[PDB]
């Protein structure tokens, strides 16, 4: 049992798939070795972890994030004044543009080395509205048939940011506001990288599916017609409701998600309401089989 | 080359018109060998102006292999081997073989070939489409080929004359088959008899089979055969699919067919 497994923290799982609330820790202070090791263990098991009532400074946010690995900010997001490491998920009450992250994805997979983790802090959030969905890509992989696993385990996938800030984004109508989103170079948006379809997590050693509808373009070597149905099945499979959890935000909630083995989704159900969270990005290494 | 027959290909994919031979007479070794060569290359072959009897029809068919026939279709009186593709001028409704398929793939050993003979056909209307499953396989990307080559598919007649006993009986064929005569690899799926990819869930199997149906039935993999009276046609039941065109409402259409037995589809 978790009450006896963990001696320095208290862990309350959110679902039988992923997610856990962590209490009995003060993120304003440096964490001792035993407390940190328990947090990391919980992170590896539960994949998305959150800490209610953590009224921390920007510096304390950065210091906590550094325990997971180096700070490596994502290309697209604006940073707060004085803190280049601390980026914004900010939506004004009156704005009606495209919602950041309103499709199932994981962050910045177009990079050669996408983020390992993101640490998100609720600054000012609605009483209700603006939950974040998460899902386990371990579970998504583990629930495929043995035959389907054998069929796809050797495949590689082409990723790019073309639909987010590349040529395909610039061709369409649904645009982000300048609140949290930078103006970007089109060539950076179109730059392709190839990642494995199934990846091994370097911390847990576990295999997970690695595909997302936002950044994945096609299966490497296949035509668009060949790739489209296989990728579409995998999106529908991974995003099955039974593979998900739903996180409700409160002021001063600090959340860490694993950017390799989870996907996440914004919920745009708070029109007319201010929503502001900050985030630091933990650098990762090249996704590997 | 062709020294004993004249061969006119119909498209750059499949189909050929063969002339310079009389199918009423027995074929010598040299002529037969050339016909078989053309059959292996062109997959669907047709011979205009062959006013052959029922007996001559059977005799020609026997050169390709054993002549069965299949239990589903109705035989003409006096000739169990010779079966009817008949639609009266008064008749209207749903036509035999109006989706892309190949014959009786629910069997452990489906037919190798079918020999069709036009008796009374309209001036226009009632063409038969054919497509090459060699071409279907060959035009898949090397990556897609490698991905699906080891898959097997469950076939049954359950949607045709089963629950959805003999119709419910399942058989398993490879998704990609090697032709026992030509040695060439071809895709082997059809929407009429294929149920699922063996080992996969419904959600996994459905979109993959659906893509393969769409791919195989691409217009550029097809040919279209127009019928005339006394036209004799042979199709390869392993490496082709075919489709009847129901564009002859109110017109009489009559053809006979013999069925050549095959062996287990093999990788």
UniProtKB/Swiss-Prot annotation, chain B:
Record flagged with keyword Oxidoreductase: yes
InterPro entries, per database record: AtsK-like, TauD-like_sf, TauD/TfdA-like
Catalytic reactions on record: (R)-2-(4-chloro-2-methylphenoxy)propanoate + 2-oxoglutarate + O2 = 2-methyl-4-chlorophenol + pyruvate + succinate + CO2; (R)-(2,4-dichlorophenoxy)propanoate + 2-oxoglutarate + O2 = 2,4-dichlorophenol + pyruvate + succinate + CO2
Induction: Repressed during growth on high concentrations of 2,4-dichlorophenoxypropionic acid (2,4-DCPP).
An MF annotation (GO) of this entry: metal ion binding
Binding locations of 2-oxoglutarate: 128, 227, 253
Cofactor: Fe cation; L-ascorbate
Pfam family, one: TauD
EC number of this enzyme: 1.14.11.44
Regulation: Inhibited by divalent cations, most significantly by copper and nickel, and by diethylpyrocarbonate (DEPC).
Thermal dependence, as annotated: Optimum temperature is 30 degrees Celsius.
SUPFAM superfamilies per record: Clavaminate synthase-like
Pathway assignment: Xenobiotic degradation; 2-(2,4-dichlorophenoxy)propanoate degradation
Binding positions (Fe cation): 101, 103, 242
Cellular component, GO annotation: cytoplasm
Biophysicochemical property: pH dependence: Optimum pH is about 6.
Alphabetically ordered keywords of this record: Dioxygenase, Iron, Metal-binding, Oxidoreductase, Plasmid, Vitamin C
The protein's role, per its UniProt record: Involved in the degradation of the phenoxypropionate herbicides. It can also accept (RS)-2-(2,4,5-trichlorophenoxy)propionate, (RS)-2-(4-chlorophenoxy)propionate, (RS)-2-(m-chlorophenoxy)propionate, however it can only accept 2-oxoglutarate as oxygen acceptor.
Subunit comment: Homotrimer.
Classification via PANTHER family: ALPHA-KETOGLUTARATE-DEPENDENT SULFONATE DIOXYGENASE
Similarity comment: Belongs to the TfdA dioxygenase family.
Name this protein carries in UniProt: (R)-phenoxypropionate/alpha-ketoglutarate-dioxygenase
Higher taxonomy: Bacteria, Pseudomonadati, Pseudomonadota, Betaproteobacteria, Burkholderiales
């Amino acid at each position: 049992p978790l009450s006896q497994r963990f001696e320095r923290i208290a862990v309350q799982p959110l679902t039988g798939v992923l997610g856990a609330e962590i209490t009995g820790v003060d993120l304003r202070e440096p964490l001792d070795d035993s407390t940190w090791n328990e947090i990391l263990d919980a992170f590896h098991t539960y994949q998305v972890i959150y800490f209610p009532g953590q009224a921390i400074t920007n510096e304390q946010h950065i210091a906590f994030s550094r325990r997971f690995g180096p700070v490596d900010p994502v290309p697209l997001l604006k940073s707060i004044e004085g803190y280049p490491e601390v980026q914004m998920i900010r939506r004004e009450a009156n704005e009606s543009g495209r919602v950041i992250g309103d499709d199932w994805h994981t962050d910045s997979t177009f990079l050669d080395a996408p983020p390992a983790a993101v640490v998100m802090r609720a600054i000012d959030v609605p009483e209700h509205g603006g939950d974040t969905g998460f899902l386990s890509m371990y579970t998504a992989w583990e629930t495929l048939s043995p035959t389907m696993q054998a069929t796809i385990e050797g495949l590689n996938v082409v990723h790019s940011a073309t639909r987010v800030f590349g040529s395909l984004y610039q061709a369409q109508n649904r645009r982000f506001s300048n609140t949290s989103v930078k103006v970007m170079d089109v060539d950076a948006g179109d730059r392709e990288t190839v990642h494995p379809l199934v990846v091994t997590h370097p911390g847990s050693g576990r295999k997970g599916l690695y595909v997302n509808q936002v950044y994945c373009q096609r299966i490497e070597g296949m035509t668009d017609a060949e790739s489209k149905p296989l990728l579409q099945f995998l999106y529908e499979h991974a995003t099955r409701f039974d593979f998900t959890c739903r996180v409700r935000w409160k002021k001063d909630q600090v959340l860490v998600w694993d950017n390799l083995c989870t996907m996440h989704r914004a919920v745009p159900d708070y029109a007319g309401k201010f929503r502001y969270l900050t985030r630091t990005t933990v650098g990762g290494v090249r996704p590997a089989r």
